[PDB]
Write a protein that binds this DNA or RNA. Structure first.
Ligand SMILES: [Mg+2]
Lengths: 126, 46, 91, 473, 145, 42, 792, 184
RNA sequence: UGUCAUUGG
DNA sequence: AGAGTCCAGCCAATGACA
DNA sequence: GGACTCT
């Protein structure tokens, strides 16, 4: 049913490629809430301030503060992506929304085929 | 009659001075008798 | 007995601690001062945090206690100690 | 600590505490002799200047991750300012003085207590205006903010850049000071008890006729001043050089720190026992400075007269400036566009003997700490170096030096060829660019040589006298 | 142990013994510092100049044997040389303060301490050697109960 | 070679500056500063 | 003897860790008759010839006698008088058969005096090895000839070989001499000048390549690397220069020994005493990179170590790489870094000596009451620890680690051998399936009694199988009481006496099995202090490795199990409330990737973002321009970064309202734009948000170690392997792993999670293998002590 | 009980099925080569069908949470409900949630064990006799609340000795015995 | 009879 | 979550000091 | 300085 919205947003020439990439990279990179308590070494201090800020539980709210300042008004798949989608299709819609923004920007939507800067042309002497 | 070191007796008397009573028990072993045993050959059989 | 506190000779601590016990053993005397004398004769670290006081617990205090120093190890007669060297006439 | 012409000396150990949870409790805090104030408000009291000034001063040459903490502590200071209706800084300071005055249950009036509290603040800055005390607190806050983020680019506490060393006479001076104060205090206690027991202004001769100093000078040689004096072991003739040249660091630590490298022997360290990594040995070119009190006062007066006579309109840069301090006492605040014009000229006048001394340490701390430090006291490790002035070796521009060297001594070289050899201390050595060899200097381009301030002597001068007994280590 | 400077010290000591004086005739030492920056070939050239001042003509095998301090040594029993040349030369050698009779201890019988009635401690007092706890572990591990 | 001779000039005694024994001169000056001037000040 | 010194033999010196540089030794005389008999029998050095764990001889030859042994084996074309001069007082019963010219192999054949065989060493008494090296004559080596001679007859024969060998080697040194001169090391300046020019060419090539990379970053043509990867690249270039120096030193050693074949330095290098290409690289080549705590020396004040380098100097020579050698002489900075390593090693061994002593005393007092009882079992108190001591009920000095021969279908009885291998094949694949066992435990050294024989005189094949099977069944009944699995003994006797590779006579097999029954009957006895012997061997080994600095610290990307004494002490401490290294092995990488994404710590600040904010009416707007190569180097996506920032801003207290948008700036940039209004006071909360934003916007468990997915080749058996993916996580509990699809995944936790899930036997097994792994490579003989500790 | 920790329980219930058809079998992961599972997952009851491969015998286990237990016997049932408890409890059909955080039967740390019959128990008890009078050695101990004792359970055969087949780097397999002691 | 200092394997 | 408590290799040798 | 236990 999302092909209606995705043909509203972009052509049907790089469409199911976008769909399969968003599906497998959303089911691959799905992130839960993992740990980070102070009952369990040191990074750079500019990041360590925020890290030991985020270690404690009193700096976090008990329930999620929903966003208020309205963004993404050209692409209003967010209107369902707020709370109609919460399982795998939420991150699937997020990934295809990023792909739609990249392909309307006219640039590569993947990150695997953004190929590495090979640095062993500077460090291959002797 | 006991045959212990002098430092053992000094240690036991000082532990008695701390209040720990140390009481030793002795073996009144039953008198044992040697009886003859059968022949045992541990060499293998080929 | 006196065998745990012999006459020290060079030119006892427990005898002095018992004397400080018996210096408070009177009918017109509190149980707190007798209790403090008994405690610092037996174990000073119950009421204090100082070492080097020769009390009863000195025979069971740490590495230099009585068993580790004088029972499983001792200084012996018929002993010797010397520098070593090699020998070719010695197998 | 007070300057050495102020007897008896005053020690004041201050502490600044910072928490990201409580940025309003940025508390300067001593023990039983000072109040617990916000340091931004204390600098506002001493310097009499706005908080936007302190924000612009702490954010001038800082990386942008430090400016966030600067803005946070300035906003917490403004919040604790606005929390009281019509805030006055003198009223808040005096209220804290009143509160700890009645808290300490001291039997003293409030003018004496307030003068004793606010005049004995910073004994090393005892007779300076209070605005320089406030700007000293601001530069200390700046060093704290930099050390919070870049803690490895700050001098470690086990470093030799941070410490001074006691010689033979300093033990005797410390013990004489302690026993003189004990003698006068015993006389005072005896006089007070004579007035409060019998009622006549008298003193017993049994208290007065003993100074308490004979027994102290006898027990000074027992070494118990942790491990100063000891029984001389008569192992070798070399030990009479080995022991009075060895420096003990008595309690990270005991590992070989880079600050111990040039000024101490690398190989003459103990390898076992309780003092392993604790006792170092001076190099053959390393000395420890001694100075008299008369020379100290003349030297400090001449350096302040040089700072105020020249650069007369350019030493008032308290916002966006380099604080020129002499023995941690903040004296001036130079223009940031003049610092390399200052320090070099200062070195040009140190080797010329313009100040009456040749071992005046002049450290230029760049790298967003931004301070000029002048050290004149005793107990510093100094060493001769070869001067590189503007990209050329000054040893290589004196042609008569090779023909006149054998018929002249070291002081004759320092007087007649003054810009050839500089006496550099370990703090000035740590914060400068030194070249390792003259061969390594001469194999460089003529533009790489402009970066280097000094040049080193050969490596045989980096060993002790015990290590010079060995060959080819 | 990679003590390379000992060989250079023997080479320079032997080169001093060839020529102990300078060109003025005065006793000059050989500057070989604790942290040395002159190469080994400069010391070989100095030793060559010393040995060529001593004997004004040598075969170059003899000169290379004198510089490197190699010598053919002879077995004193059979009066025949060994297989290869031996590093042979003079060096400054040091005696250390650890003598054998300062450490030599023996006790048959002697005093006993008053409390525990075991042997006394010191070496001036003629005490015993402490049969410690690890020696007790060793005699337990031998099976000698 | 010139810096080595300049460094050797520090090690030799300096009779003009009052340095008769450089390996222990700072300790002599330390004790002299105590017993000649600073004890009089204290 | 003469003098005031206690004169010991040098042959016992390595047994006591003794030098003659001022060491003292003590004596005690215990003249009690029971003690006299026990001293005469049990503590005599002939009784203590073999080591009680790994069986190698405790006595042997030292430094000069090694090279004397080598040169005595290599000598040729001697007269009878020269041979008798070398032999000395042992030339009395020397038999010249019909020869007039002799060699050193004839001297060795006379010295051994037995016609025994051994694979790789002996054949009919002659040494069939190429050279005699330090593995042949030095104490505590696995190829000792005295060990083979005492495996053949008795400890008296091994002690006689040691005495006679030391006499003959010292007579060789008296006749021929041995000395190393300076001319053997550095005969001229040619090779050292060549290596100096090579090093000063290659290190300037390294510096110019690194400067080209730095200038390409500085002008902006490439994005910069992380500091860890940059340090790894420079580390690889300097390691390549070090290996080039090593190869040059090895080629010089080869060319010198083919030019001057009588070089004494290369003679003691070939004999196996203390000279290798690395020490000759330290003398003649380069000194290498000086490591402190596994890395170079850390940067102090002004981004440097010494003031001899510029502030924030990228010079690798100023971080501790030494270009000079001991022949050239180290410069001042190089001497600083060498002295830093030396004084660090001295401080570390002084700090570790007392800790090793405390742990040694604790383990000795725990294990000292564990003995072998009258039935061959290992007990302590009234608890049975092991059913059979040393898995054989034979002494550990008699037991021989023999080669494990995997089943081949060319063998005679491949079916029975493969059936036994299917029975015992577990445990031969270990170390998280990374290692396959190459050695097993023969009950005694039966290889010295094996003589080859032509197939007409050999024992019949079925009769040899009947003999092996009947002996192993009788032993399993009568000696192990039908409660111990000794199929490894039958496997050893079936593969090593296999007629497909060796034929033996009937009397050879009778000799072997009679010796087997003799070792089962006479060697091990009740009351053997196996616990204190194992504890002393473990304690002596970790003390030696701590005082010798044998375990070098090295840093890597993943979290690894540590090696050495502090890891051994952490293992025996068994502390509860600490994190454990939990290893996840899987055939498919998707199941490891799903846990690696969720557990690996990535923050916004380590992604190197470009964060800039500006105030606007109704909103403070923060633009976060991140680079996409930084997102790919973190192995995450842009949606992961968006989720990190969104989770932090949506759950924070100081933010009152917010709204997020994602812009595309390039294929090199992604702009996360946040619109914000903070909780009043909004300026202080603004500054606190801008301070904590690069760190608090994160994901995963906070740890200093990353989680890289490794891979290796794991064993299912000897003949079948598979590629396996590995992953290690520092983790306290096992609870948060319970939300993932961890099916068909091997999980190796620490000791307390293994106890709480799998039980006490798996905890015992983990403790065994983990305590063994702390000693390093080459210490498999410490398996039997460590098990004895773990079972305690 | 979730959709992931029921497959690990299915691997455990293959070993429980093997013990239910032969109490003196050797339990390791190789037993999993002789069985086949089918899982019907639901948040009230999960049905796990274990099938023997060659004999085609089926056994249906009904897996419940500790709170909601609705057990009526289905055909081919095990005879007792399998309960996933929150903590380690006493009972052969009560598996705690920590046992099923990972896949435990396929692990290298999963042991190989047997229950001894009366002949092997008599041999072990006569080996443990010290010969002197009525004195006896003791086996090392193991708690009854362990997954080995839960797998090895038989209703009228009391489990006192468990024989373990340890991995051994030098000998292959080693035999040990633990004695099962009581809890609560 | 114990502390402190220095040193050795 | 934070203080109390106990633990820190073995065997030496000199001298000074209470 | 660091690990175990009671609070
Ligand atoms: Mg030695």
């Amino acid at each position: 049913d999302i092909r209606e919205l995705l043909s509203q947003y972009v052509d049907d020439a790089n469409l199911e490629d976008l769909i399969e990439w968003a599906m497998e990279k959303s089911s691959k990179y799905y992130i839960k809430n993992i740990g980070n308590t102070k009952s369990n070494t040191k990074f750079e201090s500019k990041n360590n301030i925020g890290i030991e800020y985020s270690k404690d539980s009193r700096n976090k709210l008990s329930y999620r503060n929903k966003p208020s300042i309205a963004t993404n008004l050209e692409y209003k798949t967010l209107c369902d992506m707020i709370k109609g989608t919460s399982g795998t299709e939420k991150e699937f819609l997020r990934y295809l929304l990023f792909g739609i923004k990249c392909i309307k920007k006219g640039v590569e939507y993947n990150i695997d085929k953004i190929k590495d800067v090979s640095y062993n042309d500077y460090f291959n002497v002797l | 009659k006991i045959d212990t070191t002098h430092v053992s007796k000094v240690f036991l008397t000082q532990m008695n001075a701390r209040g720990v009573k140390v009481k030793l028990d002795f073996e009144r072993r039953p008198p044992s008798f040697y009886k003859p045993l059968d022949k045992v050959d541990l060499k293998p059989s080929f | 007995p006196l065998i745990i506190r012999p006459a020290i000779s060079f030119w006892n601590e427990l005898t002095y601690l018992l004397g400080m016990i018996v210096k408070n053993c009177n009918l017109n005397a509190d149980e707190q001062v007798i209790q403090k004398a008994v405690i610092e004769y037996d174990d000073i670290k119950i009421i204090s945090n100082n070492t080097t006081s020769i009390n009863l617990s000195y025979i069971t205090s740490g590495k230099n206690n009585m068993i580790r120093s004088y029972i499983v190890a001792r200084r012996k007669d018929q002993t010797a100690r010397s520098v070593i060297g090699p020998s070719t006439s010695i197998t | 600590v007070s300057p050495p012409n102020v007897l008896p000396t005053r020690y004041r150990h201050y502490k600044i505490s910072l928490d990201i949870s409580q940025l309003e409790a940025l508390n300067i805090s001593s023990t039983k002799t000072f109040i617990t104030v916000n340091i931004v408000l204390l600098s506002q009291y001493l310097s009499r200047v706005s908080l936007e000034f302190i924000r612009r001063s702490l954010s001038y040459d800082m990386p942008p991750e430090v400016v966030y903490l600067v803005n946070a502590i300035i906003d917490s200071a403004k919040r604790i300012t606005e929390s009281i209706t019509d805030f006055n800084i003198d009223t808040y300071i005096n209220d804290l003085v009143e509160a700890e005055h009645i808290k300490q249950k001291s039997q003293l009036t409030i003018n004496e207590f307030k003068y004793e509290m606010l005049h004995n603040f910073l004994p090393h800055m005892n007779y300076t205006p209070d605005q320089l005390k406030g700007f000293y607190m601001i530069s200390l806050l700046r060093k704290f903010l930099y050390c919070i983020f870049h803690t490895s680019r700050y001098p470690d506490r086990d470093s030799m850049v941070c410490h001074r060393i006691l010689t033979y006479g300093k033990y005797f001076e410390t013990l004489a000071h302690d026993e003189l104060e004990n003698y006068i205090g015993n006389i005072r206690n005896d006089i007070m008890n004579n007035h409060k027991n019998r009622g006549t202004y008298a003193v017993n001769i049994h208290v007065l006729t003993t100074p308490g100093l004979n027994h102290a000078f006898s027990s000074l040689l027992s070494g118990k001043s942790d491990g100063s004096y000891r029984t001389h072991p008569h192992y070798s003739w070399m030990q009479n050089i080995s022991i009075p040249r060895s420096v003990g660091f008595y309690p990270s630590v005991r590992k070989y720190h880079p600050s111990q490298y040039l000024y101490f022997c690398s190989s003459d360290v103990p390898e076992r026992g309780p003092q392993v990594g604790l006792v170092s040995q001076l190099s053959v070119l390393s000395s420890i400075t001694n100075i008299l009190t008369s020379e100290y006062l003349d030297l400090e007066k001449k350096i302040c007269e040089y700072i105020r006579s020249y650069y007369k309109d350019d030493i008032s840069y308290f916002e966006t400036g380099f604080p020129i301090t002499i023995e941690n006492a903040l004296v001036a605040s130079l223009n940031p566009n003049m610092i390399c014009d200052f320090v070099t000229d200062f070195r040009r006048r140190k080797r010329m003997g313009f100040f009456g001394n040749l071992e005046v340490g002049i450290t230029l701390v760049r790298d967003h700490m931004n301070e000029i430090r002048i050290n004149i006291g005793a107990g510093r490790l100094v060493r001769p170096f070869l001067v590189v002035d503007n990209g050329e070796l000054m040893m290589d521009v004196c042609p008569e030096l090779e023909s006149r060297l054998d018929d002249m001594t070291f002081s004759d070289i320092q007087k007649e060829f003054p810009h050839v050899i500089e006496m550099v201390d370990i703090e000035q050595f740590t914060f400068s660019n030194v070249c390792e060899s003259v061969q390594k200097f001469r194999m460089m381009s003529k533009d790489e040589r402009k970066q280097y301030d000094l040049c080193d002597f050969p490596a045989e001068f980096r060993d002790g006298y015990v290590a010079s007994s060995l060959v080819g280590i | 142990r990679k003590t390379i400077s000992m060989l250079i010290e023997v080479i320079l000591t032997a080169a001093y013994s060839a020529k102990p004086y300078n060109n003025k005739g005065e006793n000059r030492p050989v500057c070989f510092p604790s942290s040395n920056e002159t190469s080994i070939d400069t010391y070989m050239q100095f030793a060559k100049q010393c040995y060529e001042h001593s004997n004004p003509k040598l075969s170059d095998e003899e000169l290379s044997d004198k510089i490197f301090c190699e010598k053919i040594l002879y077995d004193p029993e059979t009066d025949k040389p060994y297989a290869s040349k031996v590093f042979f030369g003079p060096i400054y050698y040091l005696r250390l303060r650890h003598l054998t009779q300062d450490k030599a201890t023996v006790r048959c019988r002697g005093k006993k301490t008053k409390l525990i009635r075991q042997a006394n401690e010191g070496r001036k007092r003629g005490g015993g050697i402490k049969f410690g706890e690890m020696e007790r572990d060793c005699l337990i591990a031998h099976g000698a109960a | 070679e010139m810096d080595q001779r300049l460094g050797y000039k520090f090690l030799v005694p300096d009779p003009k500056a009052g340095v008769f024994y450089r390996p222990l001169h700072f300790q002599y000056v330390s004790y002299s500063n105590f017993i000649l001037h600073r004890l009089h000040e204290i | 003897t003469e003098g005031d010194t206690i004169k010991i033999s040098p042959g016992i010196a390595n047994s006591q860790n003794a030098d003659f540089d001022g060491d003292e030794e003590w004596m005690i005389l215990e003249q009690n008759p029971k003690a006299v008999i026990e001293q005469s029998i049990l503590m005599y050095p002939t009784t203590l010839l073999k080591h009680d764990i790994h069986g190698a001889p405790v006595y042997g030859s030292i430094q000069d006698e090694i090279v004397a042994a080598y040169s005595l084996f290599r000598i040729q074309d001697l007269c009878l008088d020269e041979v008798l001069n070398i032999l000395g007082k042992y030339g009395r019963e020397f038999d010249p058969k019909g020869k007039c010219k002799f060699s050193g192999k004839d001297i060795y054949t006379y010295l051994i005096g037995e016609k025994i065989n051994y694979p790789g060493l002996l054949k009919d008494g002659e040494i069939i090895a190429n050279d005699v090296d330090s593995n042949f004559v030095v104490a505590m080596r696995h190829l000792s000839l005295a060990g083979l001679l005492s495996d053949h007859k008795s400890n008296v024969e091994g002690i006689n070989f040691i005495i006679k060998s030391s006499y003959v080697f010292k007579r060789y040194l008296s006749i021929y001499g041995f000395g190393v001169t300076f001319k053997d090391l550095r005969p001229n300046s040619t090779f050292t000048n060549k290596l100096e020019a090579i090093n000063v060419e290659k290190i300037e090539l390294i510096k110019e390549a690194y400067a080209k990379y730095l200038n390409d970053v500085r002008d902006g043509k490439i994005v910069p690397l992380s500091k860890a990867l940059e340090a790894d690249y420079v580390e690889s270039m300097l390691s390549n220069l070090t290996n080039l120096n090593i190869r040059e030193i090895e080629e010089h050693m080869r060319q010198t020994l083919i030019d001057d074949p009588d070089n004494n330095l290369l003679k003691m290098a070939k004999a196996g005493y203390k000279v290798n290409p690395t020490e000759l690289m330290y003398i003649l080549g380069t000194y290498g990179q000086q490591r402190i705590d596994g890395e170079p020396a850390e940067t102090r004040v002004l981004g440097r170590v010494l003031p001899y380098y510029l502030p924030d100097s990228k010079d690798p020579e100023g971080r501790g790489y030494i270009l000079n050698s001991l022949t050239k002489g180290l410069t001042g900075s190089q001497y600083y870094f060498s002295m830093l390593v030396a004084r660090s090693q001295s401080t570390d061994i002084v700090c570790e000596t007392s800790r090793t002593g405390t742990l040694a005393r604790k383990i000795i007092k725990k294990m000292e009451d564990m003995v072998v009882d009258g039935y061959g079992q290992v007990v302590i108190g009234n608890t049975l620890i092991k059913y059979a001591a040393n898995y054989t009920k034979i002494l550990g000095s008699v037991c021989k680690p023999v080669d494990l021969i995997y089943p081949d279908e060319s063998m005679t009885w491949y079916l029975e051998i493969s059936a036994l291998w299917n029975k015992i094949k577990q445990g031969f694949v270990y170390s998280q399936k990374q290692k396959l066992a190459k050695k097993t435990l023969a009950p005694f050294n039966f290889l010295v009694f094996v003589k080859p024989t032509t197939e007409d005189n050999a024992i019949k094949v079925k009769d040899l199988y009947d003999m092996i099977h009947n002996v192993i069944d009788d032993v399993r009944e009568k000696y192990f009481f039908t409660v111990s699995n000794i199929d490894f003994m039958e496997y050893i006797f079936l593969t090593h006496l296999n007629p497909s590779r060796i034929r033996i006579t009937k009397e050879t097999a009778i000799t072997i099995f009679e010796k087997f029954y003799e070792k089962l009957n006479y060697t091990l006895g009740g009351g053997t202090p196996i616990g204190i012997i194992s504890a002393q061997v473990l304690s002596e080994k970790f003390t030696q490795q701590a005082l010798s600095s044998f375990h070098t610290t090295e840093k890597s990307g993943a979290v690894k199990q540590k090696l050495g004494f502090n890891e051994f002490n952490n293992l025996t401490n068994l502390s509860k409330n600490k994190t454990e290294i939990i290893t996840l092995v899987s055939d498919d990488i998707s199941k490891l990737q799903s846990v690696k994404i969720n557990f690996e710590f990535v923050c916004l600040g380590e992604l190197n973002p470009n964060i800039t904010l500006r105030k606007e009416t109704d909103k403070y707007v923060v633009d976060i321009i991140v680079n996409r190569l930084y997102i790919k180097r973190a192995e995450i996506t842009e949606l992961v970064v968006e989720y990190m920032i969104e989770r932090f801003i949506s759950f924070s207290v100081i933010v009152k309202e917010w709204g997020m948008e994602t812009f595309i700036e390039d294929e090199d940039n992604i702009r996360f734009t946040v619109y914000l209004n903070f909780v009043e006071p909004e300026e202080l909360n603004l500054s606190k948000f801008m301070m904590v934003l690069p760190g608090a916007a994160n994901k995963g468990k906070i740890s200093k170690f990353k989680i890289p997915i490794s891979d290796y080749t794991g064993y299912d058996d000897f003949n079948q392997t598979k590629k396996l993916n590995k992953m290690t996580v520092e983790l306290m509990n096992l609870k948060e792993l319970g939300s993932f699809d961890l099916e068909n995944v091997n999980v190796y936790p620490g000791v307390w999670n293994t106890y709480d899930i799998f039980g006490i036997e798996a905890a015992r097994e983990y403790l065994c293998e983990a305590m063994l792994n702390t000693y390093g490579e080459g210490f498999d003989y410490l398996y039997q002590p460590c098990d004895l500790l773990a079972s305690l | 009980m979730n959709q992931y920790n029921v497959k690990y329980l299915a691997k455990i219930l293959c070993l429980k099925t093997e013990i239910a058809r032969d109490p003196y079998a050797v339990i390791n992961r190789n037993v999993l080569l002789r069985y086949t599972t089918d899982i019907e997952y639901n948040d009230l009851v999960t049905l796990i069908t274990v099938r023997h491969k060659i004999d085609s015998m089926k056994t249906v286990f009904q897996v419940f949470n500790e709170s909601s237990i609705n057990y009526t016997p289905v055909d081919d049932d095990y005879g007792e409900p399998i309960i996933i408890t929150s903590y380690l409890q006493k009972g052969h059909n009560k598996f705690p949630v920590n046992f099923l955080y990972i896949d435990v039967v396929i692990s290298d740390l999963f042991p190989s064990f047997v229950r001894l019959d009366t002949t092997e128990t008599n041999i072990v008890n006569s080996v443990l006799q010290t010969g002197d009078g009525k004195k006896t050695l003791r086996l090392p101990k193991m708690l009854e609340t362990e997954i080995v004792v839960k797998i090895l359970y038989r209703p009228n055969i009391p489990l006192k000795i468990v024989r373990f087949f340890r991995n051994n780097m030098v000998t292959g397999v080693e035999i040990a015995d633990r004695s099962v002691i009581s809890v609560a």
